[PDB]
Coordinates of C-alpha atoms in Angstrom, one line a residue:
Chain A
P232 CA 0.1 -0.3 -0.1
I233 CA 0.8 3.9 -0.1
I234 CA 3.1 4.5 3.1
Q235 CA 1.4 7.6 4.8
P236 CA 3.1 9.7 8.1
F237 CA 2.9 8.3 11.1
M238 CA 1.1 10.1 13.4
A239 CA -0.5 9.1 16.9
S240 CA -1.8 10.8 20.0
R241 CA -1.7 9.8 23.3
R242 CA -4.2 10.5 26.1
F243 CA -3.5 11.0 29.8
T244 CA -6.6 11.4 32.0
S245 CA -6.4 12.0 35.4
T246 CA -7.7 14.6 38.3
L247 CA -6.3 17.7 40.0
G248 CA -7.4 15.8 43.6
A249 CA -3.9 13.3 42.5
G250 CA -1.2 16.5 42.6
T251 CA 1.5 17.4 45.7
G252 CA 2.6 20.6 46.6
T253 CA 1.1 24.4 46.2
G254 CA 2.0 26.8 44.7
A255 CA 3.8 26.5 41.5
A256 CA 5.3 23.3 42.2
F257 CA 2.0 21.5 42.1
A258 CA 2.0 18.1 40.4
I259 CA 0.2 15.5 38.7
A260 CA 2.5 12.2 38.6
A261 CA 2.9 10.1 35.7
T262 CA 1.9 6.7 38.1
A263 CA -1.5 8.2 39.0
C264 CA -2.8 9.1 35.4
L265 CA -4.4 7.0 33.3
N266 CA -3.3 6.5 29.5
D267 CA -5.6 5.8 26.5
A268 CA -6.1 1.8 27.6
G269 CA -8.1 2.0 31.1
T270 CA -5.2 1.6 33.4
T271 CA -2.5 3.1 35.6
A272 CA 0.2 4.8 33.4
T273 CA 4.0 4.3 33.6
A274 CA 6.1 6.8 32.1
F275 CA 5.0 10.0 29.7
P276 CA 6.0 9.7 26.4
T277 CA 8.0 11.5 24.0
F278 CA 6.1 14.3 21.9
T279 CA 6.3 17.4 19.5
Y280 CA 3.9 19.1 20.9
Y281 CA 0.9 18.8 23.7
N282 CA -2.0 19.9 25.0
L283 CA -3.4 19.8 28.0
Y284 CA -7.3 19.7 29.0
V285 CA -8.7 21.5 32.6
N286 CA -12.1 20.8 32.5
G287 CA -12.5 20.4 29.0
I288 CA -11.1 23.4 28.2
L289 CA -7.9 24.0 26.0
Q290 CA -5.0 25.3 28.4
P291 CA -2.7 27.7 26.7
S292 CA 1.0 26.7 27.0
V293 CA 2.3 29.0 30.0
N294 CA -0.2 27.4 32.3
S295 CA 1.4 24.1 32.7
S296 CA 5.1 22.3 32.0
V297 CA 5.4 18.4 31.6
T298 CA 8.2 16.1 31.4
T299 CA 8.4 12.9 30.4
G300 CA 10.3 10.0 31.4
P301 CA 9.5 7.2 34.3
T302 CA 9.8 10.1 36.6
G303 CA 7.6 12.7 34.5
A304 CA 5.2 15.1 35.9
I305 CA 3.0 17.9 34.4
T306 CA 3.4 21.2 36.6
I307 CA 0.5 22.9 36.5
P308 CA 0.5 25.7 39.1
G309 CA -2.5 27.0 40.5
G310 CA -4.5 24.5 40.4
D311 CA -4.2 24.3 44.1
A312 CA -7.3 26.7 44.6
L313 CA -9.5 25.3 42.2
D314 CA -11.2 22.0 43.0
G315 CA -10.4 18.0 43.7
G316 CA -12.8 16.7 41.3
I317 CA -12.4 19.0 38.1
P318 CA -10.8 16.6 35.0
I319 CA -7.4 16.6 33.8
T320 CA -6.4 15.5 30.2
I321 CA -2.7 15.3 29.0
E322 CA -2.8 14.8 25.0
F323 CA 0.5 14.0 23.8
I324 CA 1.5 14.4 20.2
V325 CA 3.7 11.2 18.8
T326 CA 5.2 12.2 15.3
Chain B
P65 CA -16.8 4.9 31.0
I66 CA -17.4 7.9 29.6
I67 CA -15.8 11.3 30.7
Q68 CA -18.5 13.7 31.6
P69 CA -18.0 17.7 33.0
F70 CA -17.7 18.3 36.5
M71 CA -20.1 20.4 38.2
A72 CA -21.0 20.9 42.2
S73 CA -22.9 22.9 44.5
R74 CA -22.0 24.0 47.7
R75 CA -24.4 25.3 49.7
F76 CA -23.8 26.9 52.8
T77 CA -26.8 27.5 56.0
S78 CA -27.1 30.2 58.4
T79 CA -29.5 33.5 59.6
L80 CA -30.1 37.2 58.8
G81 CA -29.4 37.4 63.2
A82 CA -25.3 36.3 62.8
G83 CA -24.5 39.5 60.8
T84 CA -22.5 42.6 62.0
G85 CA -22.9 46.0 60.9
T86 CA -26.1 48.6 59.5
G87 CA -26.7 49.5 56.2
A88 CA -24.8 48.7 53.1
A89 CA -22.2 46.4 55.6
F90 CA -24.5 43.9 56.5
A91 CA -22.3 40.8 56.0
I92 CA -22.6 37.0 57.3
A93 CA -18.8 35.6 57.8
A94 CA -18.0 32.7 56.2
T95 CA -17.2 31.5 59.5
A96 CA -20.8 31.2 61.4
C97 CA -21.9 29.3 57.9
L98 CA -23.2 25.8 58.2
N99 CA -21.6 24.0 54.9
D100 CA -23.8 21.1 53.2
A101 CA -22.8 18.8 55.3
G102 CA -23.9 20.3 58.8
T103 CA -21.3 21.6 60.7
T104 CA -19.2 25.1 60.8
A105 CA -17.1 25.5 57.8
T106 CA -14.0 27.8 57.4
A107 CA -13.9 29.2 53.6
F108 CA -16.5 30.2 51.0
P109 CA -14.5 28.5 48.6
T110 CA -14.0 29.5 44.2
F111 CA -17.3 29.6 41.7
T112 CA -19.0 31.0 38.5
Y113 CA -22.2 32.2 39.9
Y114 CA -23.9 32.4 43.1
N115 CA -27.4 31.8 44.3
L116 CA -29.0 33.3 47.4
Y117 CA -32.3 32.3 48.9
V118 CA -33.3 34.6 51.8
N119 CA -36.4 32.7 53.2
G120 CA -36.8 30.2 50.3
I121 CA -36.9 33.0 47.7
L122 CA -33.7 33.7 45.5
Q123 CA -33.2 37.1 45.1
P124 CA -31.4 39.2 42.8
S125 CA -27.5 40.0 41.8
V126 CA -27.7 42.9 43.2
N127 CA -29.1 42.4 46.6
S128 CA -25.5 40.2 47.6
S129 CA -22.2 40.4 47.0
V130 CA -19.7 37.6 48.1
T131 CA -16.1 37.1 48.9
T132 CA -13.8 34.3 48.7
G133 CA -11.1 32.7 50.9
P134 CA -10.8 32.1 54.3
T135 CA -12.6 36.1 55.2
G136 CA -15.1 35.7 52.8
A137 CA -18.1 37.2 53.8
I138 CA -21.5 37.5 52.1
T139 CA -22.5 41.3 51.7
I140 CA -26.1 41.6 52.2
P141 CA -27.2 44.9 52.6
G142 CA -31.0 46.1 54.2
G143 CA -30.7 42.8 56.2
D144 CA -30.6 44.8 59.4
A145 CA -34.1 45.1 59.3
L146 CA -35.6 42.5 58.6
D147 CA -35.9 39.6 61.6
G148 CA -33.3 37.2 63.2
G149 CA -34.6 33.8 62.1
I150 CA -34.5 34.2 58.6
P151 CA -33.3 31.3 56.7
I152 CA -30.1 31.6 54.3
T153 CA -29.0 29.5 51.4
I154 CA -25.9 30.6 49.7
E155 CA -25.6 27.9 47.2
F156 CA -22.1 28.4 44.7
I157 CA -21.5 26.5 41.4
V158 CA -18.2 25.5 41.1
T159 CA -17.8 23.7 37.7
Chain C
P77 CA -4.4 32.0 35.0
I78 CA -6.6 28.7 34.8
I79 CA -9.5 28.9 31.7
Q80 CA -12.4 28.1 33.1
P81 CA -15.8 27.2 31.8
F82 CA -17.8 29.8 31.3
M83 CA -21.7 29.9 32.7
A84 CA -23.8 32.7 34.0
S85 CA -27.4 33.2 35.7
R86 CA -29.7 35.6 34.6
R87 CA -32.8 36.0 36.7
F88 CA -35.8 38.5 35.8
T89 CA -37.9 39.0 38.5
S90 CA -42.4 40.4 38.7
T91 CA -45.6 39.4 39.4
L92 CA -48.5 37.6 38.1
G93 CA -50.3 40.7 38.6
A94 CA -48.8 41.9 35.0
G95 CA -50.1 39.7 32.9
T96 CA -52.4 39.7 29.3
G97 CA -55.3 37.2 28.6
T98 CA -56.1 34.4 30.5
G99 CA -56.2 30.5 30.0
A100 CA -53.4 29.7 28.3
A101 CA -52.6 33.2 27.0
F102 CA -51.6 34.3 30.3
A103 CA -48.1 35.7 29.7
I104 CA -45.7 38.6 31.5
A105 CA -44.0 40.2 28.8
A106 CA -40.3 40.9 28.9
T107 CA -40.6 44.3 29.2
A108 CA -42.4 44.6 32.4
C109 CA -40.2 41.8 34.7
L110 CA -37.1 43.7 36.0
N111 CA -34.0 41.9 35.5
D112 CA -30.8 40.8 38.3
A113 CA -30.0 44.8 38.4
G114 CA -33.7 46.5 39.4
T115 CA -34.5 48.6 36.1
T116 CA -37.4 47.6 33.5
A117 CA -35.3 45.0 31.3
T118 CA -36.0 44.8 27.4
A119 CA -35.1 41.6 26.2
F120 CA -35.6 37.5 27.7
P121 CA -31.6 36.7 26.5
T122 CA -30.5 32.6 24.8
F123 CA -30.6 29.9 27.4
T124 CA -29.9 26.0 27.2
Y125 CA -32.6 25.6 30.4
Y126 CA -34.6 27.7 32.5
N127 CA -36.0 27.5 35.9
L128 CA -39.7 29.4 36.7
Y129 CA -40.2 30.6 40.4
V130 CA -43.7 31.0 41.5
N131 CA -43.6 32.1 45.0
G132 CA -40.5 30.4 46.2
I133 CA -41.4 26.9 44.5
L134 CA -40.2 26.0 41.7
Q135 CA -42.1 24.4 38.8
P136 CA -41.9 21.7 36.2
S137 CA -41.1 22.2 32.9
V138 CA -45.0 22.4 31.8
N139 CA -46.2 25.0 33.5
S140 CA -44.6 27.6 31.4
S141 CA -43.3 28.6 28.4
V142 CA -40.6 31.2 27.4
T143 CA -39.3 32.8 24.6
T144 CA -36.6 34.9 23.7
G145 CA -36.0 38.0 21.6
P146 CA -37.0 41.8 22.3
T147 CA -40.3 40.2 22.0
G148 CA -40.5 37.3 24.2
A149 CA -43.1 36.6 26.8
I150 CA -43.4 33.6 29.8
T151 CA -46.2 31.7 28.7
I152 CA -47.8 30.8 32.5
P153 CA -50.8 29.2 31.9
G154 CA -53.4 28.4 34.5
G155 CA -52.3 32.3 36.3
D156 CA -55.4 34.2 35.3
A157 CA -57.1 32.4 38.9
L158 CA -54.4 33.1 40.9
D159 CA -53.9 36.7 42.8
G160 CA -52.3 39.4 41.1
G161 CA -49.3 40.0 43.9
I162 CA -47.7 36.3 43.8
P163 CA -43.7 36.8 42.5
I164 CA -42.5 35.6 39.7
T165 CA -38.7 34.8 39.2
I166 CA -37.5 33.6 36.1
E167 CA -33.5 31.8 35.5
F168 CA -31.7 31.2 32.7
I169 CA -28.6 29.5 32.5
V170 CA -26.9 30.8 30.0
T171 CA -24.0 28.6 28.9
Chain D
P205 CA -25.0 27.5 14.0
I206 CA -22.4 27.7 16.7
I207 CA -22.4 24.3 19.4
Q208 CA -23.6 25.1 22.5
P209 CA -22.3 22.8 25.6
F210 CA -25.4 20.6 26.6
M211 CA -27.5 21.3 30.0
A212 CA -30.4 20.0 31.2
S213 CA -32.6 20.3 34.1
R214 CA -34.7 17.3 35.1
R215 CA -37.9 18.1 37.6
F216 CA -39.9 15.6 39.6
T217 CA -42.6 16.1 41.7
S218 CA -44.1 14.6 45.1
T219 CA -45.0 14.8 48.5
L220 CA -43.8 13.3 52.1
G221 CA -47.0 11.8 51.9
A222 CA -46.1 8.9 49.8
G223 CA -43.2 7.4 51.7
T224 CA -41.6 4.3 52.7
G225 CA -41.1 3.2 56.6
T226 CA -39.5 5.2 59.2
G227 CA -36.4 6.8 60.6
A228 CA -33.3 6.4 58.1
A229 CA -35.5 4.9 55.9
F230 CA -38.0 7.4 54.4
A231 CA -37.6 7.1 51.1
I232 CA -39.7 8.3 47.9
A233 CA -40.0 5.9 45.1
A234 CA -39.3 6.7 41.5
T235 CA -42.8 5.5 40.2
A236 CA -44.4 7.8 42.8
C237 CA -43.0 11.1 41.7
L238 CA -44.2 12.9 38.6
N239 CA -41.9 14.2 36.7
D240 CA -41.6 17.0 34.5
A241 CA -44.2 15.9 32.0
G242 CA -47.0 15.9 34.4
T243 CA -47.4 11.6 34.5
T244 CA -46.2 9.4 36.5
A245 CA -42.4 8.9 36.2
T246 CA -40.5 5.4 35.7
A247 CA -37.2 6.1 36.5
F248 CA -34.5 8.7 38.2
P249 CA -32.2 9.7 35.6
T250 CA -28.3 10.2 36.0
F251 CA -26.8 13.4 36.8
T252 CA -23.9 14.9 38.3
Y253 CA -25.5 17.0 40.8
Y254 CA -29.1 16.8 42.8
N255 CA -31.2 19.3 44.3
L256 CA -34.0 18.3 46.9
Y257 CA -36.8 21.4 47.3
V258 CA -39.0 20.5 51.0
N259 CA -41.6 23.2 50.8
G260 CA -40.0 25.4 48.6
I261 CA -36.2 25.3 50.6
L262 CA -33.6 24.3 49.0
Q263 CA -32.1 21.1 51.6
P264 CA -28.3 21.1 51.7
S265 CA -26.7 17.5 50.5
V266 CA -26.5 16.1 54.1
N267 CA -30.3 15.6 54.9
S268 CA -31.0 13.5 51.0
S269 CA -29.7 10.3 49.2
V270 CA -31.2 9.7 45.9
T271 CA -30.4 6.7 43.6
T272 CA -30.7 6.0 40.2
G273 CA -32.4 3.2 37.7
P274 CA -35.7 2.0 37.4
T275 CA -35.2 1.3 41.8
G276 CA -34.3 4.6 42.2
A277 CA -35.5 6.2 45.8
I278 CA -34.8 9.3 47.4
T279 CA -33.8 8.5 51.2
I280 CA -35.2 11.3 53.1
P281 CA -34.2 11.1 56.8
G282 CA -36.1 12.1 59.5
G283 CA -39.4 12.8 57.3
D284 CA -41.7 10.8 58.7
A285 CA -41.9 12.8 61.3
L286 CA -42.8 15.6 59.0
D287 CA -46.7 16.1 57.4
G288 CA -47.8 14.4 54.9
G289 CA -48.4 17.4 52.4
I290 CA -45.1 18.9 52.4
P291 CA -44.2 19.0 48.7
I292 CA -41.3 17.9 47.4
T293 CA -39.2 19.2 44.2
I294 CA -36.0 16.8 43.0
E295 CA -34.4 18.6 40.2
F296 CA -31.5 17.1 38.4
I297 CA -28.8 18.6 36.2
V298 CA -27.8 16.4 33.4
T299 CA -24.4 17.4 32.4
Chain E
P285 CA 6.5 29.3 -3.0
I286 CA 7.6 27.0 -0.3
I287 CA 5.8 23.5 -0.8
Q288 CA 5.0 22.8 3.1
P289 CA 3.5 18.9 4.5
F290 CA -0.2 18.4 3.8
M291 CA -2.5 18.2 6.8
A292 CA -6.6 18.4 7.2
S293 CA -9.0 18.3 10.2
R294 CA -12.6 16.6 9.8
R295 CA -15.0 17.1 12.0
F296 CA -18.3 15.3 11.9
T297 CA -21.0 16.5 14.2
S298 CA -24.0 14.3 15.8
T299 CA -25.2 13.5 18.6
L300 CA -26.2 10.4 21.4
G301 CA -29.9 10.3 20.2
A302 CA -29.4 9.4 16.6
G303 CA -27.4 5.9 17.7
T304 CA -28.8 1.9 17.3
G305 CA -28.5 -1.0 19.5
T306 CA -27.9 -0.8 23.3
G307 CA -24.6 -2.3 24.6
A308 CA -21.2 -2.3 23.6
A309 CA -23.7 -2.4 19.7
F310 CA -24.2 1.2 20.4
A311 CA -22.9 3.5 16.8
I312 CA -23.3 6.5 15.3
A313 CA -23.9 6.1 11.4
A314 CA -22.0 7.8 8.9
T315 CA -25.2 8.8 7.1
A316 CA -26.6 10.5 10.5
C317 CA -23.0 13.2 11.0
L318 CA -23.1 16.8 10.5
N319 CA -19.4 16.9 8.6
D320 CA -17.8 20.6 8.3
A321 CA -20.2 21.7 5.9
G322 CA -23.6 21.9 7.6
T323 CA -24.9 18.8 5.3
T324 CA -25.8 15.0 6.2
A325 CA -22.7 13.2 5.1
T326 CA -21.9 10.0 3.5
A327 CA -18.6 8.7 4.5
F328 CA -15.9 8.4 7.1
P329 CA -12.8 9.4 5.0
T330 CA -9.5 7.5 5.9
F331 CA -7.4 8.7 9.0
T332 CA -4.5 8.5 10.9
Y333 CA -5.5 8.9 14.7
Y334 CA -9.3 10.3 15.6
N335 CA -10.7 12.4 18.5
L336 CA -13.9 12.0 20.2
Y337 CA -15.5 14.8 22.0
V338 CA -18.4 13.6 24.3
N339 CA -20.7 17.4 25.1
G340 CA -17.0 19.1 24.2
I341 CA -14.7 16.2 26.7
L342 CA -11.7 14.6 24.8
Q343 CA -12.7 10.8 25.5
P344 CA -9.7 8.4 25.9
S345 CA -9.3 5.8 22.7
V346 CA -10.7 3.0 24.6
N347 CA -14.1 3.7 24.8
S348 CA -14.6 4.3 21.0
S349 CA -13.9 2.4 18.0
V350 CA -14.5 4.1 14.2
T351 CA -15.1 2.1 10.8
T352 CA -14.6 4.4 7.9
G353 CA -16.4 3.7 4.3
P354 CA -19.4 4.9 3.2
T355 CA -21.0 1.9 6.0
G356 CA -19.3 3.4 8.6
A357 CA -19.7 3.7 11.5
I358 CA -18.7 5.0 15.0
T359 CA -19.0 2.2 17.7
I360 CA -19.4 4.3 21.6
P361 CA -20.0 1.9 24.1
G362 CA -22.2 2.4 27.0
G363 CA -24.2 5.7 25.5
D364 CA -27.4 4.3 25.6
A365 CA -27.3 5.3 29.0
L366 CA -26.3 8.5 28.7
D367 CA -28.8 11.6 27.5
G368 CA -30.0 11.6 23.7
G369 CA -28.8 15.5 23.6
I370 CA -25.5 15.1 24.2
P371 CA -23.5 16.4 21.1
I372 CA -20.8 14.2 19.6
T373 CA -17.7 16.1 17.7
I374 CA -15.7 13.2 15.8
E375 CA -12.3 14.8 14.4
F376 CA -9.8 12.4 11.7
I377 CA -7.3 13.9 11.0
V378 CA -5.9 13.4 7.5
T379 CA -1.9 13.3 6.9
Chain F
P119 CA 19.6 12.8 17.8
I120 CA 17.3 11.5 15.4
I121 CA 16.0 14.3 13.8
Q122 CA 12.0 14.2 13.7
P123 CA 9.3 16.2 12.3
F124 CA 9.0 19.7 13.0
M125 CA 5.4 21.1 14.5
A126 CA 3.7 23.0 17.2
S127 CA 0.4 24.4 18.5
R128 CA -0.1 28.2 18.8
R129 CA -3.3 29.2 20.9
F130 CA -5.3 32.7 20.6
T131 CA -7.3 33.4 24.1
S132 CA -9.7 36.2 23.9
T133 CA -13.7 36.6 24.5
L134 CA -16.7 37.0 22.3
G135 CA -17.6 40.9 24.3
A136 CA -14.4 41.8 21.4
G137 CA -15.9 41.3 18.2
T138 CA -16.6 44.3 15.8
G139 CA -19.4 44.5 13.5
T140 CA -23.3 42.8 13.6
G141 CA -23.9 39.7 11.4
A142 CA -21.5 38.0 9.2
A143 CA -18.9 40.4 10.0
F144 CA -18.4 39.7 13.5
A145 CA -14.6 39.5 13.6
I146 CA -12.2 39.1 16.8
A147 CA -9.4 41.4 15.8
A148 CA -5.5 39.8 16.0
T149 CA -4.9 42.7 18.6
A150 CA -7.0 41.7 20.8
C151 CA -6.5 37.8 21.5
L152 CA -3.9 36.8 24.1
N153 CA -1.2 34.2 23.2
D154 CA 0.0 31.2 24.7
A155 CA 2.7 33.4 26.6
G156 CA 0.0 35.2 28.3
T157 CA 0.4 38.9 26.6
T158 CA -1.4 40.7 24.2
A159 CA -0.5 38.8 20.3
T160 CA 0.6 40.8 17.5
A161 CA -0.7 38.9 13.9
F162 CA -2.4 35.5 13.2
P163 CA 0.7 33.2 12.0
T164 CA 0.4 31.1 9.2
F165 CA -0.9 27.8 9.5
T166 CA -2.4 24.5 7.8
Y167 CA -5.3 24.0 9.5
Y168 CA -7.2 26.1 12.7
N169 CA -9.5 24.7 15.0
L170 CA -12.0 26.9 17.0
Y171 CA -13.1 26.3 20.6
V172 CA -16.0 28.4 21.4
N173 CA -16.5 28.2 25.4
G174 CA -14.4 24.6 24.9
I175 CA -16.3 23.3 22.1
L176 CA -14.7 22.2 19.2
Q177 CA -16.8 24.0 16.5
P178 CA -16.8 22.7 12.8
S179 CA -14.9 25.2 9.5
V180 CA -18.2 26.5 8.6
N181 CA -18.3 29.0 11.7
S182 CA -15.4 30.6 11.5
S183 CA -13.6 32.3 8.8
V184 CA -9.3 33.0 10.2
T185 CA -7.1 35.5 7.9
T186 CA -3.2 35.6 9.2
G187 CA -0.6 39.0 8.9
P188 CA -0.7 42.1 11.5
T189 CA -4.7 42.5 10.2
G190 CA -5.5 39.4 11.2
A191 CA -9.5 38.7 12.4
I192 CA -11.0 35.5 13.0
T193 CA -14.9 35.9 11.3
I194 CA -16.8 34.2 13.8
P195 CA -19.9 34.2 11.8
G196 CA -23.7 34.9 14.5
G197 CA -21.1 35.6 17.5
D198 CA -24.0 38.5 18.2
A199 CA -26.5 37.1 19.7
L200 CA -24.3 35.1 21.6
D201 CA -23.0 36.7 25.2
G202 CA -20.0 38.7 25.7
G203 CA -17.9 36.2 27.9
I204 CA -18.2 33.1 26.1
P205 CA -13.9 32.2 25.9
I206 CA -12.6 31.4 22.9
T207 CA -9.5 29.5 22.2
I208 CA -8.2 29.4 18.3
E209 CA -5.5 26.9 18.0
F210 CA -3.1 26.7 15.2
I211 CA -1.0 24.0 13.5
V212 CA 1.8 25.0 12.1
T213 CA 3.4 22.3 10.2

């Protein structure tokens, strides 16, 4: 068949109630984020650009900071003041 | 399961007899308002829009002014002339 | 800051004594309903779902019919037989 | 047209005189609650948060417990001592 | 001019009330989904990865299954229990 | 290291209350849209395909028209009738 460029989306789901610290250190660990399969994930994969969805709203690139690897953690500052039931959807575009 | 948008209602109950000052400074402190659990609350949470129920009647947005934080206090002007047994129900829609 | 979903409540207050016609044509005009500011409003805004409060009691969705626009009018059938001093509180949830 | 978020309110009306048991088992069955159409309903639908209106007064979240499904029943403890003519208005916000 | 890689997004809009069957067979036909033009579409086009938006919330890759061709149908299990007015937005990234 | 294809997402945030004109001329200027940094932007960059998010809902390609350059403006018809507080999120995929 005709070869086409490879592109894939990896989506991790969690809640704002599974964070650590307060202030600019509020981070959701990669070991507390369910991936696109329905199980507890292990590591955030490498990406080119990522999208953060707080309660279904696409957030800008200044309100989040994500690190890959087994010890990865998405740094969402200001999330401590928000409620603990707000869903989080982190989408990685691996190309 | 299917992820759904998060929405929650926080209801605080008090009476008009637990206010301070007279005139437009009549305010019910957040430390004298029982939340939806049956205990003395501590701070009014962040919201998007709030509803005030004076004796079960939904009041407009011009007869009340609510502030969040530990030092929060709902400013209900004109409540001094009313009776001290009138129930107050403050509903916060946290989305 | 973190972007949050937008939601707002528009409340219009009037009385059953400012209606027109009898039977199923009893309607309260949008030009005779005070909005949440304390002045005579002009038009019922667009909404997703609306709540009607007759004397502080939440009515079902079968006892009222509301139309938007400058010529809007909430159609409350059977209100002619009721007293003319019954307050009306119409709440629109604009999301 | 512009797509907007979907939100709907389902209101069920009954009286405190149609309950079963005494104490903390006082429950109003879903088959004895008239929905927002004016007929006998069948099942309480799924929701995100619900509001209970006893005689037009918004009750907190600790004085009621609602279950969905065909065998649903709102558990209102302490309602046996109250009168049998007190109206009940259960509002479900399905988002 | 400078040649750039080609990428396009195809968005189909429908509601959960236009599904067939119950359980894991709940599927929205491609002939009942309005495409990004405002008309009734005919076939789901070929893609590399697809995103499903239930009520504006990005769903994971385990709660949906989409097939292309004229007889295509997005298989969304568990949608029968949900309301019939929930919007559906299916985005195909054709690269 | 291994060279990978370049892809980037540019997100601009504004509100429906910062538009000009009525009807099909309702446009949000590029000088009144905050980019993904938190400051007032200057020009919409070149893209391949763009996504419009009205109140967190992904809109089709027929309800918007975006122009690049310093004088760029996203043409969203029908937004005049909507509320002025509805957030707008414009995502450009520059590949």
